[PDB]
Symmetry: C4
Subunit: 364 residues, 4 copies
Amino acid sequence: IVNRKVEHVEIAAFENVDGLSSSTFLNDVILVHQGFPGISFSEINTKTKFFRKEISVPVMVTGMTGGRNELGRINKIIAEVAEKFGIPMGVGSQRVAIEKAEARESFAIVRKVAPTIPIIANLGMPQLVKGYGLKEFQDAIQMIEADAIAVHLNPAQEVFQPEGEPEYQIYALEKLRDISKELSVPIIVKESGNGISMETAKLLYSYGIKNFDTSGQGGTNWIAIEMIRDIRRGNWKAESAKNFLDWGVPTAASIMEVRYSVPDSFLVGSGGIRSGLDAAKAIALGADIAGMALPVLKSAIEGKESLEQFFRKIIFELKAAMMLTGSKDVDALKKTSIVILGKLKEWAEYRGINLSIYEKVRKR
Amino acid sequence: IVNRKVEHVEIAAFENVDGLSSSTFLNDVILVHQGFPGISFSEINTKTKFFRKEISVPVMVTGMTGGRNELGRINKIIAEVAEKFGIPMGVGSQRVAIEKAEARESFAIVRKVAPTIPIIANLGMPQLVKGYGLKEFQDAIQMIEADAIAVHLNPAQEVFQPEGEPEYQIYALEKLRDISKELSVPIIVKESGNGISMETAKLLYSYGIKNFDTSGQGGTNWIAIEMIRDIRRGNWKAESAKNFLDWGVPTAASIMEVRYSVPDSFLVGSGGIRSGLDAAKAIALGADIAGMALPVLKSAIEGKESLEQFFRKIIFELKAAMMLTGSKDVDALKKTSIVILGKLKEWAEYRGINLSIYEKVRKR
Amino acid sequence: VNRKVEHVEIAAFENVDGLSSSTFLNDVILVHQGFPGISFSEINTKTKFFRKEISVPVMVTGMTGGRNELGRINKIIAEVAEKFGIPMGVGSQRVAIEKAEARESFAIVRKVAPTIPIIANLGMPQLVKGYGLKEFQDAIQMIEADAIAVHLNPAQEVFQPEGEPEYQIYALEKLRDISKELSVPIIVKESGNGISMETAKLLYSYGIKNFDTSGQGGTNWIAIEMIRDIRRGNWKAESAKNFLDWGVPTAASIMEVRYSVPDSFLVGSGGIRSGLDAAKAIALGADIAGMALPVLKSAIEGKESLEQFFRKIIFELKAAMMLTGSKDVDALKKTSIVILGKLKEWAEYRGINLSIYEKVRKR
Amino acid sequence: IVNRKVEHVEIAAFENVDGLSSSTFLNDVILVHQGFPGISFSEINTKTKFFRKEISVPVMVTGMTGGRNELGRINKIIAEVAEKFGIPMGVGSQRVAIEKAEARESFAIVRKVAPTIPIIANLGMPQLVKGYGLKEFQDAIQMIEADAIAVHLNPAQEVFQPEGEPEYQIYALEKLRDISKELSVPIIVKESGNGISMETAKLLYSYGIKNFDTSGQGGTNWIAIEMIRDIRRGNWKAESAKNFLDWGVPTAASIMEVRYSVPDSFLVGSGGIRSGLDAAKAIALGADIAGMALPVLKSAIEGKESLEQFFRKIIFELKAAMMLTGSKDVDALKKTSIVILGKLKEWAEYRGINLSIYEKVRKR
Ligand SMILES: C/C=C(\CCOP(=O)(O)OP(=O)(O)O)C[C@@]12Nc3cc(C)c(C)cc3N(C[C@H](O)[C@H](O)[C@H](O)COP(=O)(O)O)C1=NC(=O)NC2=O
Ligand SMILES: C/C=C(\CCOP(=O)(O)OP(=O)(O)O)C[C@@]12Nc3cc(C)c(C)cc3N(C[C@H](O)[C@H](O)[C@H](O)COP(=O)(O)O)C1=NC(=O)NC2=O
Ligand SMILES: C/C=C(\CCOP(=O)(O)OP(=O)(O)O)C[C@@]12Nc3cc(C)c(C)cc3N(C[C@H](O)[C@H](O)[C@H](O)COP(=O)(O)O)C1=NC(=O)NC2=O
Ligand SMILES: C/C=C(\CCOP(=O)(O)OP(=O)(O)O)C[C@@]12Nc3cc(C)c(C)cc3N(C[C@H](O)[C@H](O)[C@H](O)COP(=O)(O)O)C1=NC(=O)NC2=O
Ligand SMILES: [Mg+2]
Ligand SMILES: [Mg+2]
Ligand SMILES: [Mg+2]
């Protein structure tokens, strides 16, 4: 399992798996340019709420890694930069540290170095059907003094991953619902590159889930990562993974689906957010914050100052989109004028997303 | 006419005629990803009914060959693997064996080696206007102890094939309707690479036909095969065949057309089914089972263990698609959520396929 | 005289067929019928062309004439058309109204094709330049024509180095008067840029009932004149280039004319290159399919080349009828189609109600 | 400073910034061909009104340059040819000449050499928030005896330009409105490559602005120009500019939006007008006149006779479109039949541009 954590980072960082045969549908979203913005750049306010805390920018780093010391040093760099910028940070799956106690430090370092920002713990849905419960959740949370815990959905990844098994019985949701009653922090349910649909969002909501992270297709392709792991071990599933490279809900469509089917959700729009303009689009479309993982990893590996430059660039690009839409603050961005075209439009139409009611929901 | 059988197999197996200038429209069908499936992979049930028998997977091998001993050995390999996997198998046109009695064994071997699975006999619609009747149908059936007989439509192929004629007078259907009253097994009407429209489906239904096999364009291109036979004999029809390479109803559209216009039909979706994902899409769209021919031929030529690996891959991919849509069984897959986009959408719209009533009919 | 030779040479040997243009015929699909309900041998391709019967619903539209080498091309086309029972238009006869030595290069057509419909040809601009009844009667008598086509070519005239585009309404007043005295009917045809519903309705309001779409996507006359311009260092060349995709695509023109004048007799032409294109043109609303350029190219190759060409067109037409369950031309006109993509958006923007369209193209 | 002025001309003239990663959407507009025009070429009348003057062609040169003598000599060439053709001419931003008095001659030369055509002064909207007022406007106007003054919107350019700031407080519009009461000539508000939306047009109209110049995306890409200036000085904003290369309202969409949202506006359609056919399309879509800048610059640099040939070509192409549309004059062109397809069609639909009421407004 420890080797898999390193192999994941190495394939994501150095192989060709970002947007491989997949699409966010964000090219189908246009933010309407305002030649008279009505504001000045210096007055743009990017602050927003993240549960009980305030954050500096409506962007987060979503969970990636942890489990060995070299992974901990990646976590350390991301956490210290995130703290500097006032940006929330999720950690990778903490399964490895619930088991092997030597793996705990590679997660705990995050809170040592980032005492103020929201920190989000991480466990997988399949562990709920395998005997994780309240205590494991509390241990994941306490380990980093987390402000929330993300529970990940990754059935696509599990199906193609060489080492077993995709298990998603409804009992897991009953358990999740029970756990949420005893926990002192909120639960976020996030996908892992394949996106959340309205049926999935409504099912989760019916069990008390109110916080969602789209992780749609078009960014890091987890089916591709497992495909590569399969190719590497001469596992025949590789050719089957290849047929599923474009499987999933595109990020842009997932954001629309979650916002429309659960209008009061707190929503992270993620999966292929690569610029402050993507982030601006995600928010205008209906997300409360934009999430990123892969490009943060790649910069962090390059080093601290590379990662600081990366965030400087994201933030500037976000502010430029706010400036050029006349959005003085995040709230104004959420209601700014957009155009939806092409395949995203056809997707919304077939799925019964009445654009008229969509407009009202995304902006009230 | 025996060596036409050989030439067909050789061109299909070794020339470039799969999907040549043609399209299934299956790229316009998306199965909606469910990040919380509600099931586990191991509980997925792929069993379904095929007339009076149960089959293990909702997939069949459609009719191809027979007529000489080398063709019989291909039939033998396919039949033994299909028996092993619990998959129905059609044989190729049995005309050759109604005439030449030496050709009978190359069909009969199928039932010797596959005693339990449904086996489907095969005769051509033109033979009905050329003097075939009850006795020839009963002989075709008895020869392999068939559980059904497929009657093929191939006017496109006949038009471009160097040797003779396209004959499809309505008298053939009168005869077919009479024969169906005396036969102890059901009749399936199948196309052969060019697809079944609603006009054709309704006409066949008005003569008592209830079982259809779409064989749409986008897979094996029979116009291309005959084009190649023409090029080879310096026949001028070759250039004309080239103008018709994209002629026919795409598989996806044919499935919609048959299901919509004959809502209670038993429906095989075929013509360019190349993965278990294609098979999942065909079923979700409205078929009861997915049919395949060419890729089974190519693998069978490679050998028994190649064909076994092929089916293992198809079945895995089908189950992956079911897993990732939350479909515990074939019935759930038939009603799972989809998106229809692009040209298939415009096709449906022009043809008056009301998507609202469409969604209703396919989900039953 | 020399323009006439240059036109044939550029059309035949330069790259001007469908150059930056489109028929929109790729947006039309004929619905395949796996049970046709007919046999190939019973397919009947006969149809009416005014007072005559023709063997196939296809015509050769007007191209050339004016010198003896052009007459020998006309002769080859006419003799093959006669053999196949196919109507033939000749090129503009202006040259032969003027120069009397040019008459034989047109007259040869009737000598060699005594039974098929033969269609005379004069340009609409000539009506504002003094041509009238007598010139029309001369063009007709010269080949014992069964009809006369009057061509519209303002686009060609705008970019052609030598002079002017003149289309005052007076021309139509004159045309209407002429039609009262003439013993054969008038067809109005374009020349590569298509007939719109505004143009069709205007012509209909002056008594014109016979149209030939000659839409964009086939022979590109703006391109031909662009080439003549490039050759003489004329600056208009670069401007012609900007207009290479100007005009109504053939498929859209057929829809527009059939829709806006439901009882018209309609030739669908401009980029018809196969019997499948011909089948589509007819299913879409034309009564017959016209061709020019590919007949020219084959004729230049020779008699037997042109015979093989027609054999191919006819087989391809019959294949589409077979595969559509169309026993005759009338059944083809009502066969099931799908319209997609840009043609669909064109019709929508133009207010072509598809529901009423279907009714009109069928009845 | 003043060499930013020369650097702009140099990059625009000699680098690849025309339509870079951007689009006018003019390919989605088709003028319907009329095979019987009902006119002759020689009777086509291209005259139209430009405020209190008559002009020979419905085309103008929009503002570009001025500030140094070499820039003045470009202005001189453009002005003398515009005078010869009866075409209105805008000058570039006159800020430089309000400040440095040595820069005045490079603007004044325009009126010396073009005594009769409309000449349009130019000042930036940002200068209104930076203390420019009535006197600066009157000085800009008097310096060239202007018949109007254009106030330019360029927040996109300012955001990416290395030297300083985007400031667009509503106070500027209050000031602009006050200034317009004291001015003896009308105000045009123009963009600068990124286009005017309906929200921006309605806001300006609410402050008394009735004259608009779209300057949509698809022509000169000002974000690209500044990107290049950034690349040249190793400024990190370069990579961010690259993410915004396709930002803005396309010219064709901007024409539709301004005509639709302010039906009585006097409207210049500009941003990527490169031929008389583009000019014809812009007018048929709803503009009163077509504007051009970059191609006029490029020809002017080549010299007087190159620029004369350029206009000869534009005018011929415009008349060809009028001829082939049966438009005897500019008024008939404004109501000629068109087709709108593709992305422009989807843009208008999403933005609630009812095509039925649209046709009425552009024709009346
Ligand atoms: C499915 C992924 C997993 C589950 C672990 O599998 P198992 O080994 O079965 O876990 P175990 O059995 O419990 O040990 C790993 C994950 N770590 C992970 C590694 C790296 C390197 C990349 C790039 C991304 C993620 N993300 C997805 C990101 O958070 C984003 O949502 C996504 O990448 C889209 O954003 P984009 O990258 O900006 O386009 C993860 N998400 C998680 O929820 N948990 C994690 O641990
Ligand atoms: C028209 C085709 C014929 C009729 C025989 O012609 P005639 O010689 O006139 O018969 P006669 O006069 O009676 O002697 C041959 C056929 N054999 C045949 C051979 C090979 C090698 C392949 C690949 C395809 C088929 N299929 C089509 C397949 O079953 C599928 O429908 C199709 O391939 C789409 O699925 P994909 O392959 O997955 O894309 C046949 N269909 C049949 O109904 N009968 C047959 O005998
Ligand atoms: C505008 C064209 C003219 C007018 C002559 O110009 P002027 O010199 O002004 O004549 P004058 O001043 O009066 O002496 C020439 C034309 N001859 C002609 C030459 C060649 C070689 C080809 C290929 C095409 C045509 N066609 C168009 C064809 O009939 C078809 O409509 C068209 O080609 C689309 O079908 P596709 O080729 O199958 O794609 C003609 N159309 C005519 O009506 N008259 C003719 O004389
Ligand atoms: C925003 C533009 C500016 C601001 C100056 O920057 P600052 O230094 O901030 O100004 P300061 O601080 O006040 O000194 C420069 C501009 N000059 C200018 C230079 C050249 C060389 C080109 C090609 C074009 C423009 N245009 C836009 C053109 O008129 C067209 O609208 C546009 O090009 C689309 O039409 P297409 O070229 O046909 O595609 C100008 N527009 C203006 O309103 N003012 C000008 O000074
Ligand atoms: Mg896991
Ligand atoms: Mg046969
Ligand atoms: Mg002429």
